[PDB]
Amino acid sequence: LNCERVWLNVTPATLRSDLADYGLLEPHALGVHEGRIHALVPMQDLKYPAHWQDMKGKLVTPGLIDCHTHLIFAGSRAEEFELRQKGVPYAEIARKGGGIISTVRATRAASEDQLFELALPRVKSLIREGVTTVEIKSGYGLTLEDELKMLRVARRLGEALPIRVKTTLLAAHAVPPEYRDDPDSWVETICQEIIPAAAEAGLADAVDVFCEHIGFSLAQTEQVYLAADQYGLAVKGHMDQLSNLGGSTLAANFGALSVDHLEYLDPEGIQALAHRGVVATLLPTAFYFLKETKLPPVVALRKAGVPMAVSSDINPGTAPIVSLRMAMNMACTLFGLTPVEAMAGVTRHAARALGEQEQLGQLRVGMLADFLVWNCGHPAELSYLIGVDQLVSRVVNGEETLH
Ligand SMILES: [Fe+3]
């Protein structure tokens, strides 16, 4: 079996695009070579070495992927939240510094080393849940130096821990205080300085925008995308979360990897996404914490065949929950997804959302060897039972990482 590492007797939920549901197969032997799945052979065709690990029929799935997080940040909005729960009017909270700006001030003030130290434990929670690839965004700096410093912390995390990290420049998350009366000059700084400096330093894998009434207009959004294109950077966007400005269609035209939130996505946007092969990313935890009532158009997205990814949206003000599995559970409960859709949402579709559809998310020969051996019987459990370590083996790039 011409490869150096082999797992015997694994029951694979391949999650192959061409196989129904979970793509579950009879017991197999999984061999890896040079960080890639080198062979998948039915145990019945075999009858070890000795360093060949026998999983004794335990379930194996591709590593989990959560394609939309803001897990890098400093400060705490817990007290602000408490003031709100107590009845203190939002206006009062705001004038004293509450809101996203609060996170921005804390993050700007925090040193690169501090942000790294603050992010370590957050990533560790995802790791033990089975997350092998995580996407992390900037957007809490709102200055060239602070945006790039966040991207660097993200790069550091990937080097320091056994996990793949995709970085996303999200400088247009909000208009910084210094540009309050000049929203349009902030856009130019992004296009002519921040994106360029980020690209030159190889710090951004993609560019993202918060297209919203309390964010950036469709026009301002188009500006960024144009700049990202010039430096050969992939794009994506935060859209239709609170309102529909037509951002989803625009993103689709630019060949956006994906569009996130989608609470207010319309029929035309859906057609666009389906045609351009854009991934629709559902962020149920944010929907929950914000007590939103307008549900994303899941039914229409399904009818149109638009793949839906599921992610945690870990962030200080909107989704303070560091768990991808909780998000899967909420996608099912709040959005009506099936456990199988949720699973595909954190593997196959999440991979595509990050432009890694050819390298991750499925147990196919030739793709990266990122998989997990669980102690639970069926993959449906991954969306059901939450908060319990259940990994027996976590392999990234062909290597055991659990120890
Ligand atoms: Fe987000």
XYZ file of C-alpha atoms and ligand atoms in Angstrom:
404
model
C 0.000 0.000 0.000
C 2.848 2.132 -0.991
C 2.401 4.856 1.746
C 4.005 5.270 5.207
C 1.003 5.778 7.477
C -2.165 3.740 7.580
C -5.349 3.619 9.606
C -7.023 0.211 9.556
C -10.712 -0.482 10.146
C -12.150 3.007 9.948
C -15.785 3.522 9.003
C -15.510 6.506 6.634
C -18.143 9.218 6.231
C -16.359 10.521 3.144
C -18.761 13.380 2.568
C -18.020 13.016 -1.119
C -19.919 15.391 -3.383
C -21.032 12.480 -5.590
C -22.304 10.308 -2.728
C -25.654 10.747 -1.000
C -25.984 12.076 2.544
C -22.785 11.505 4.528
C -21.111 9.364 1.907
C -20.673 6.616 4.518
C -18.840 3.460 3.448
C -18.098 0.017 4.879
C -14.894 -0.342 6.940
C -11.815 0.818 5.035
C -8.083 1.227 5.440
C -6.950 4.801 5.007
C -3.384 5.363 3.866
C -1.639 8.710 3.644
C 1.461 9.796 1.792
C 3.187 13.169 1.961
C 0.307 14.913 3.691
C -2.318 13.565 1.295
C -4.866 10.764 1.384
C -2.999 8.205 -0.705
C -5.483 5.336 -0.665
C -8.878 4.217 0.590
C -9.305 0.452 0.498
C -12.168 -1.750 1.757
C -11.091 -3.921 4.700
C -12.670 -6.898 2.950
C -10.081 -6.574 0.184
C -7.363 -6.894 2.819
C -6.218 -9.695 5.104
C -0.046 -5.651 9.276
C 2.889 -3.847 9.328
C 2.588 -3.049 13.049
C 2.728 0.723 13.241
C -0.513 0.570 11.317
C -3.150 1.852 13.645
C -6.342 -0.161 14.065
C -9.259 2.165 14.772
C -11.438 -0.921 15.211
C -14.330 0.351 13.108
C -14.544 3.834 14.624
C -16.075 6.582 12.476
C -13.716 8.833 10.523
C -14.699 12.120 8.871
C -12.851 14.961 7.190
C -11.597 17.660 9.547
C -14.130 20.366 10.412
C -13.833 23.830 8.888
C -15.333 27.061 10.146
C -15.014 29.675 7.417
C -16.160 32.822 9.213
C -14.635 34.024 12.490
C -13.392 37.185 14.216
C -11.706 35.214 16.995
C -8.859 37.743 17.227
C -9.746 40.710 19.416
C -9.126 42.296 22.822
C -11.405 43.902 25.387
C -14.735 42.671 26.703
C -18.300 43.778 26.042
C -19.780 41.660 28.866
C -20.301 44.696 31.128
C -21.876 46.649 28.270
C -24.204 43.691 27.748
C -25.077 43.654 31.444
C -25.955 47.354 31.338
C -28.323 46.590 28.444
C -29.943 43.664 30.249
C -30.440 45.968 33.237
C -32.315 48.521 31.165
C -29.694 51.189 30.570
C -30.689 52.894 27.272
C -28.457 52.076 24.324
C -27.859 55.775 23.679
C -26.257 56.173 27.099
C -24.109 53.080 26.610
C -22.972 54.412 23.249
C -21.846 57.875 24.386
C -19.623 56.260 27.000
C -17.916 54.153 24.331
C -20.087 51.078 23.912
C -20.449 49.278 20.608
C -18.021 47.863 18.048
C -15.844 50.938 18.531
C -15.217 49.619 22.046
C -13.706 46.463 20.609
C -11.730 48.511 18.097
C -10.188 50.690 20.801
C -9.277 47.656 22.904
C -7.791 45.832 19.919
C -5.807 48.852 18.664
C -4.399 49.287 22.158
C -3.515 45.610 22.576
C -0.073 44.550 21.398
C 0.417 41.898 18.734
C 1.790 39.544 21.403
C -1.247 40.158 23.629
C -3.760 39.421 20.864
C -1.896 36.191 20.122
C -1.996 35.148 23.779
C -5.700 36.064 23.973
C -6.486 34.070 20.822
C -4.607 30.867 21.744
C -7.238 29.479 24.159
C -10.047 30.351 21.721
C -8.460 28.342 18.922
C -7.745 25.480 21.325
C -11.483 25.075 21.926
C -12.101 24.729 18.189
C -9.229 22.266 17.827
C -10.649 19.807 20.351
C -14.046 20.050 18.599
C -12.455 18.781 15.389
C -11.842 22.075 13.554
C -8.747 21.608 11.367
C -9.074 24.776 9.263
C -10.344 28.105 10.512
C -10.781 31.426 8.730
C -9.948 34.534 10.771
C -10.691 38.149 9.851
C -9.193 41.546 10.668
C -11.641 44.440 11.060
C -11.110 45.493 14.696
C -8.114 47.675 13.942
C -9.334 50.199 11.377
C -5.856 51.572 10.579
C -3.233 50.088 8.272
C -0.922 48.934 11.086
C -3.673 47.523 13.280
C -5.356 45.627 10.438
C -2.065 44.045 9.348
C -1.127 43.259 12.931
C -4.334 41.214 13.274
C -3.482 39.338 10.076
C -0.016 38.617 11.487
C -1.442 37.235 14.724
C -3.646 35.004 12.580
C -0.545 33.809 10.666
C 1.247 33.198 13.980
C -1.636 31.098 15.286
C -1.397 28.824 12.245
C 2.317 28.312 12.821
C 2.045 27.816 16.572
C -0.867 25.363 16.540
C -1.744 22.253 14.469
C -4.490 23.995 12.496
C -4.773 25.627 9.056
C -5.596 29.332 9.027
C -7.040 31.399 6.209
C -6.788 35.128 6.729
C -9.282 37.654 5.514
C -8.770 41.383 5.395
C -11.941 43.042 6.659
C -10.846 46.676 6.911
C -14.294 47.850 5.780
C -16.098 46.407 8.803
C -16.903 49.944 9.978
C -15.733 53.527 9.418
C -13.073 54.454 12.007
C -13.558 57.524 14.278
C -10.875 59.512 12.429
C -12.909 59.184 9.210
C -16.358 59.719 10.768
C -17.288 62.720 8.589
C -15.441 61.283 5.571
C -16.600 57.699 4.940
C -15.230 57.829 1.395
C -11.635 58.663 2.234
C -11.436 55.579 4.453
C -12.387 53.550 1.389
C -9.467 54.973 -0.579
C -6.999 54.232 2.226
C -8.228 50.665 2.010
C -7.878 50.468 -1.736
C -4.579 52.316 -2.119
C -2.706 51.478 1.077
C -4.124 48.712 3.262
C -4.974 46.134 0.600
C -1.624 46.830 -1.185
C 0.442 46.657 2.010
C -1.384 43.493 3.048
C -0.817 41.853 -0.334
C 2.829 42.905 -0.486
C 3.350 41.234 2.886
C 1.403 38.113 1.866
C -0.892 38.581 4.872
C -4.369 38.345 3.313
C -5.857 35.258 1.652
C -9.067 37.137 0.869
C -10.857 40.487 1.279
C -14.281 40.995 2.940
C -16.743 43.868 3.459
C -19.562 44.689 5.823
C -22.137 45.909 3.317
C -24.954 47.381 5.393
C -26.803 50.617 6.206
C -24.750 50.836 9.406
C -21.765 49.729 7.359
C -20.697 50.428 3.808
C -22.799 51.152 0.743
C -22.955 48.969 -2.360
C -20.788 51.554 -4.155
C -18.145 51.693 -1.426
C -18.205 47.906 -1.369
C -17.596 47.757 -5.122
C -14.533 49.982 -4.672
C -12.791 47.522 -2.358
C -13.546 44.521 -4.547
C -11.953 46.337 -7.456
C -8.779 46.910 -5.463
C -8.655 43.318 -4.187
C -8.881 42.106 -7.766
C -5.844 44.164 -8.790
C -3.694 42.366 -6.233
C -5.094 38.960 -7.098
C -6.999 38.491 -3.857
C -10.225 36.519 -3.501
C -13.310 38.319 -2.149
C -16.418 37.736 -0.029
C -18.929 39.767 1.965
C -21.039 40.369 5.062
C -24.491 40.893 3.574
C -28.229 41.089 4.000
C -27.750 40.629 7.747
C -29.925 43.613 8.705
C -30.951 44.941 5.273
C -30.706 44.269 1.522
C -28.597 46.765 -0.460
C -28.006 44.397 -3.370
C -24.574 43.419 -2.090
C -25.039 39.695 -2.668
C -25.568 40.149 -6.412
C -22.497 42.401 -6.631
C -20.330 39.859 -4.811
C -21.535 37.152 -7.190
C -20.471 39.279 -10.161
C -16.970 39.498 -8.721
C -16.790 35.740 -8.349
C -17.064 36.023 -4.584
C -16.093 32.883 -2.687
C -19.149 33.368 -0.475
C -21.696 35.758 1.043
C -22.409 35.685 4.796
C -25.446 36.126 7.100
C -28.143 36.450 4.378
C -31.132 37.171 6.673
C -32.565 39.476 3.987
C -31.347 37.758 0.837
C -33.812 38.169 -2.059
C -34.879 35.934 -5.011
C -32.629 37.728 -7.524
C -29.587 37.443 -5.282
C -30.233 33.727 -4.995
C -30.227 33.214 -8.767
C -26.956 35.108 -9.004
C -25.329 32.984 -6.300
C -26.547 29.757 -7.886
C -25.199 30.791 -11.271
C -21.831 32.122 -10.111
C -21.362 29.190 -7.738
C -21.099 31.416 -4.650
C -21.389 29.700 -1.258
C -24.055 30.984 1.128
C -22.725 31.026 4.713
C -25.262 30.750 7.518
C -24.323 32.242 10.878
C -27.032 30.940 13.274
C -25.268 31.873 16.540
C -25.305 35.549 15.593
C -28.975 35.253 14.692
C -29.598 33.803 18.151
C -27.579 36.235 20.261
C -28.994 39.265 18.446
C -32.503 37.912 19.038
C -33.231 38.369 15.320
C -36.598 37.169 13.946
C -36.100 37.445 10.157
C -34.842 34.038 9.036
C -32.353 33.655 6.166
C -34.043 32.240 2.999
C -32.974 28.643 3.628
C -35.883 27.062 1.769
C -35.291 29.178 -1.348
C -31.540 28.568 -1.209
C -32.178 24.827 -1.097
C -34.628 24.962 -4.012
C -32.049 26.921 -5.996
C -29.261 24.475 -5.117
C -26.976 27.075 -3.535
C -24.567 25.288 -1.172
C -24.861 26.518 2.399
C -21.954 26.588 4.775
C -22.382 26.828 8.541
C -19.989 28.790 10.737
C -19.673 30.129 14.296
C -19.071 33.823 13.486
C -17.104 33.999 16.739
C -16.907 37.683 17.589
C -16.983 39.972 20.697
C -20.287 41.753 20.055
C -22.508 39.473 17.994
C -21.583 35.806 18.522
C -19.547 35.399 21.742
C -19.707 31.591 21.480
C -16.512 29.709 20.686
C -17.989 26.533 19.253
C -18.568 25.320 15.711
C -20.692 22.381 16.902
C -23.047 24.668 18.791
C -23.506 26.582 15.506
C -24.300 23.296 13.722
C -26.914 22.507 16.386
C -28.419 25.983 15.976
C -28.410 25.773 12.183
C -30.621 22.686 12.560
C -32.821 24.014 15.361
C -33.228 27.650 14.296
C -32.820 27.427 10.518
C -34.258 23.983 9.934
C -31.181 22.375 8.472
C -30.683 18.623 8.677
C -27.684 17.192 10.479
C -26.358 16.009 7.129
C -26.607 19.524 5.637
C -24.892 20.992 8.676
C -22.056 18.471 8.374
C -21.619 19.203 4.672
C -21.834 22.847 5.752
C -18.688 22.537 7.882
C -16.699 20.363 5.474
C -17.368 20.299 1.726
C -19.215 23.627 1.462
C -17.011 25.379 4.037
C -13.957 24.255 2.044
C -15.439 25.749 -1.136
C -16.226 28.951 0.789
C -12.482 29.240 1.418
C -11.556 28.294 -2.135
C -10.164 24.974 -0.921
C -12.795 22.741 -2.585
C -10.030 20.787 -4.337
C -7.902 20.241 -1.236
C -10.156 19.817 1.792
C -13.567 18.744 3.026
C -13.841 15.224 1.606
C -12.177 11.872 2.181
C -10.983 11.364 -1.402
C -7.642 10.046 -2.648
C -5.414 12.929 -3.680
C -6.813 15.505 -1.238
C -5.091 16.713 1.934
C -5.014 14.262 4.818
C -7.124 16.212 7.307
C -9.505 13.827 9.042
C -10.877 12.864 12.424
C -11.506 9.582 14.195
C -14.405 9.843 16.631
C -15.664 7.661 19.448
C -19.327 8.369 18.610
C -21.172 6.030 16.255
C -22.905 8.177 13.648
C -22.003 11.555 12.054
C -25.508 12.838 12.835
C -24.243 13.125 16.437
C -21.791 15.907 15.535
C -24.705 18.338 15.195
C -26.690 16.870 18.102
C -24.588 16.347 21.249
C -22.535 19.453 22.014
C -19.623 20.304 24.296
C -17.992 16.910 24.850
C -14.499 15.989 23.639
C -15.079 12.958 21.426
C -11.970 12.765 19.273
C -9.765 9.701 19.420
C -7.488 11.023 16.697
C -7.104 14.376 14.945
C -4.951 14.286 11.833
C -3.814 17.376 9.949
C -1.642 17.079 6.837
C -1.243 13.374 7.589
C 0.056 13.846 11.150
C -1.505 13.025 14.522
C -2.080 16.234 16.493
C -3.893 15.032 19.599
C -0.411 14.331 20.929
Fe -18.761 38.179 10.924
